Amino acid sequence: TCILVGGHEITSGLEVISSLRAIHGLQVEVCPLNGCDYIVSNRMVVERRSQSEMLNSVNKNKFIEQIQHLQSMFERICVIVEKDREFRRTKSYDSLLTTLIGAGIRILFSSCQEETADLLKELSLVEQRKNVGIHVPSNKSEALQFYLSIPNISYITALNMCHQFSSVKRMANSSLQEISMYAQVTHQKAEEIYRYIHYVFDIQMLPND
Amino acid sequence: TCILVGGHEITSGLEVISSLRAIHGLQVEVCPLNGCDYIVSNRMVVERRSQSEMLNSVNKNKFIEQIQHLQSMFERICVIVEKDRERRTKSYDSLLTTLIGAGIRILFSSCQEETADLLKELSLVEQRKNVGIHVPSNKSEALQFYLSIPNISYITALNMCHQFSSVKRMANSSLQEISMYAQVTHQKAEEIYRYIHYVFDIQMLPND
Amino acid sequence: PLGHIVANEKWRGSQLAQEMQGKIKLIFEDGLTPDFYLSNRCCILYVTEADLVAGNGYRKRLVRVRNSNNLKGIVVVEKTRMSEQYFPALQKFTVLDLGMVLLPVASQMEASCLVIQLVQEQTKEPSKNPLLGLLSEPSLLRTVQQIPGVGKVKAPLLLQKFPSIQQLSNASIGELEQVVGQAVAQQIHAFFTQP
Amino acid sequence: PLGHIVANEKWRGSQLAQEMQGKIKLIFEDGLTPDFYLSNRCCILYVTEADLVAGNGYRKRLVRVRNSNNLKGIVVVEKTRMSEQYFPALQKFTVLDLGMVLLPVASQMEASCLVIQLVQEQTKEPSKNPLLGLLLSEPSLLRTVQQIPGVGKVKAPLLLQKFPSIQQLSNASIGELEQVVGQAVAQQIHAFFTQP
DNA sequence: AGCGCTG
DNA sequence: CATCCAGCGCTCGG
DNA sequence: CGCTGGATG
DNA sequence: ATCCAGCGCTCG
Ligand SMILES: [Mg+2]
Ligand SMILES: [Mg+2]
Ligand SMILES: [Mg+2]
Ligand SMILES: [Mg+2]
């Protein structure tokens, strides 16, 4: 069972990463993800935030925009609020939690990096049982960057495309249903990708210059 | 056998990293290293460069400065020139001969898998010189303090964090203790000892 | 009820009930299994320090609420220094088995200020929750610029002649050669067909 | 020899020997095990495509050179598409077992332009090699002390005025700290240095 | 912004 | 036939 | 933008 | 028991 970790997590998550490998026996790869912490399945991303980050009202609007970005690419979003390493609550903190609950963003609480890794593993198990887990094992590097350029798809979706389509042409000539199954995305999401690849470019929709 | 990888290597080295784990059975940790690719031991750092990066003369002086930085922290520097993924110049040959003349070892690799193989071989040699990395959360402030010490590597700072029960114990250590516990040379322990015993003088700085 | 909270008798004059005074009104009532009701369909199951130390007696009630139709439970739990060790096991059960919301609190004082927010959130319309409530041309330029050989200048020329990614992908070397050089045509063709 | 290369007879009129003409002078000679000598103490062992396909016949000669005192070998090897499979095994042997320098070349043409550089590097003084040829610690020490929690830009210099080394700072009592920074930041500093 | 490649 | 710039893609570092 | 210590009640 | 001013800290 596989999990992708954002590279930025090495500046604060080293015990999360190494527990996941060592204690839990997941395949753990540290990846250049753009805008997320833990991709746990094809459907589920997990954001890791310290109490302090959640308390700090400077971070509120930026967090909500982060969650909004993640909503366009993932069906299941989890926030793990991890205790700071060696806490007074604010209205803004309670307000954020209630906001998240009202939008069905799941919240978990962790007292250390080891416990964060434990929750990540449990979340990994649930998703595996919904047959949406990450399936991966590379002279297909140009192709990956192309697929990542497709709007509102996650790194794992782009990876699936790279792995599953023998060529880019084969991807671009696929049906909506094929994109759904091979890229492991929802109907709606396969629809967005299909419309994009069939979209009739018009130079006159851009400024003249 | 442990090896530390700079986090930047995930933008170009994913097969190097995963081979090292999977094929070679090293403990591989991706780390926030500042200015190096692979720390293979307490004495040895390995820089990984594509042929293109080596050919590109825009990169020559920048590479030389990078090797100079690394010389202040490591006794053994290796460059692995890795063939680009799917044409030779004087400045390329010039760089190679420069590196030879300063005893910087050069290895050549045709793919990321072969780079991982060389990194593993280099790991083995260093293990046999008893300078290998030995490592396994409340010590985080201490690490950042030790990393602030000039001209020491990430692994030297980690050793300090792991070996000294407290920072005070570190700062009261002998030169010899620093040598052994931080796993650095005499010269390097001397530089750390002088730093910790250096008499700060505010009048050596400008005023405003 | 409107502007109100239906409450279990057992919270009569507790620190929780005291700090909600003036902020929000409490209709007490007997025979209630859950601790509070925010609306008719959202309830609270307060698990105390005592509840969590003892064992898994708290769970019985949680199961009832989840397995009720026409009702949803928010579990609020007293996460102290004493209880912190038991909290993982509870959270696994509450959040991951049963699928219910769990909110830790240090004390009843905190649960006061938290429950006021839940009620302010319930009363709010779902639009003003920001997590509930473009031309592709620019993106397509950038996608096509990922093709080797193709930069700023060649990207728009290609999308003028082959107006979709699909049509671009199906273009012959001959069709490509008319728009870009023989060399950049090979690069594009190679990119789309390399297995 | 000065401005010169002592060469093995076998390279008479080869593409290598041809491209070096005018650039550099070749004294040929018989009975030489190594291919060229740049100076008296640095030699070259050219391993050809033929050498590398056959097996490990090349190694005999390499062992002799490394095990010679008063002599160092640079191994230049023909890394073609044909040979590339054998190159890892050679490089492990040459670089990691024997400790010798190894430089791949596509062809003799490349080895020409490479050997000219080695000779230009040998002739060069070791100072003008930038990887061969002291500071106030005050700025660093400010930054080190700023890693102590509670201590920023302003408190760092005040502490180093009273406790002028990291060691003395590390040994300072809470009492001594209280005079400079006040009770809370004193505890933080003391805690930092002594937490086991 | 400078550098190598293509018509 | 062999070149010479000029435009472009690319990389790099602000 | 919160916390600490200190001047003002 | 209380405003605020200076500082450390985080973030852009
Ligand atoms: Mg229910
Ligand atoms: Mg391109
Ligand atoms: Mg010798
Ligand atoms: Mg500080």
Numbering used by the authors:
A (entry chain C): 1818 to 1903, 1912 to 1962, 1967 to 2038
B (entry chain A): 1818 to 1903, 1913 to 1962, 1967 to 2038
C (entry chain D): 15 to 147, 153 to 214
D (entry chain B): 15 to 147, 152 to 214
Paper text:
FANCM recognizes branched DNA structures and promotes their remodeling through ATP-dependent branch migration.
To understand how FANCM’s different regions cooperate in DNA recognition, we further determined the crystal structure of its C-terminal region bound to FAAP24 and branched DNA at 2.4 Å resolution. The splayed arm DNA bases were not visible in the electron density, indicating that they were conformationally disordered and therefore not bound specifically by the protein. The new structure also reveals a previously unappreciated 5 bp dsDNA binding site within the FANCM pseudonuclease domain complementing the known contact with an additional five base pairs of DNA by FAAP24’s HhH domain. Separated by an eight basepair gap, this arrangement enables recognition of approximately 18 continuous base pairs, substantially more than previously known DNA-binding sites in the complex. In striking contrast, removal of FAAP24, which binds FANCM’s C-terminal domain, severely compromised the stimulatory activity (lanes 9–11). A patient-derived mutation truncating the C-terminal HhH domain (p.Arg1931∗; rs144567652) associated with cancer predisposition and infertility showed similar defects, and is consistent with previous observations that both the C-terminal region and FAAP24 are essential for FANCM function.
